[PDB]
Design a protein around this ligand. Structure first.
Ligand SMILES: [Zn+2]
Ligand SMILES: [Zn+2]
Ligand SMILES: [Zn+2]
Ligand SMILES: [Zn+2]
Ligand SMILES: [Zn+2]
Ligand SMILES: [Zn+2]
Lengths: 85, 18
């Protein structure tokens, strides 16, 4: 249940936002503000359910949409080689 | 509450040898 980045992934906070770099492939990705917030809270050890609760309490988003959006982001992070399965 | 923008991930580029 623990969200983990792949070992070769580095993170930077920049003026464009949060960036993830794959040190093997050289691919690097920009996360928008919501994606960065989700990833940061998952890396803190919070569950996706925790993060959904946070998003609904802080943003104009329904709980159902928050859960789907978190799940889609995590799936995309795994798809694109940033997060471990 | 804050305006919600759905999470987005964008590939910026690929670092290679020069
Ligand atoms: Zn990789
Ligand atoms: Zn944190
Ligand atoms: Zn928790
Ligand atoms: Zn806040
Ligand atoms: Zn909706
Ligand atoms: Zn909805």
């Amino acid at each position: 249940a623990e969200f983990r980045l792949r070992p070769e992934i580095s993170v930077a906070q920049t003026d464009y936002g949060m960036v993830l770099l794959d040190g093997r492939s050289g691919e690097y990705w920009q996360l928008n503000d919501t994606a960065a917030l989700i990833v940061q809270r998952l890396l803190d050890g919070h569950s996706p359910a925790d993060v959904a609760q946070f998003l609904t309490s802080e943003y104009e988003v329904e709980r159902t949409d928050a859960e789907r959006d978190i799940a889609a982001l995590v799936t995309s992070l795994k798809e694109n080689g940033m997060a471990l399965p | 509450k804050k305006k919600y923008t759905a999470p987005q991930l964008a590939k910026v580029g690929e670092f290679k040898e020069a």
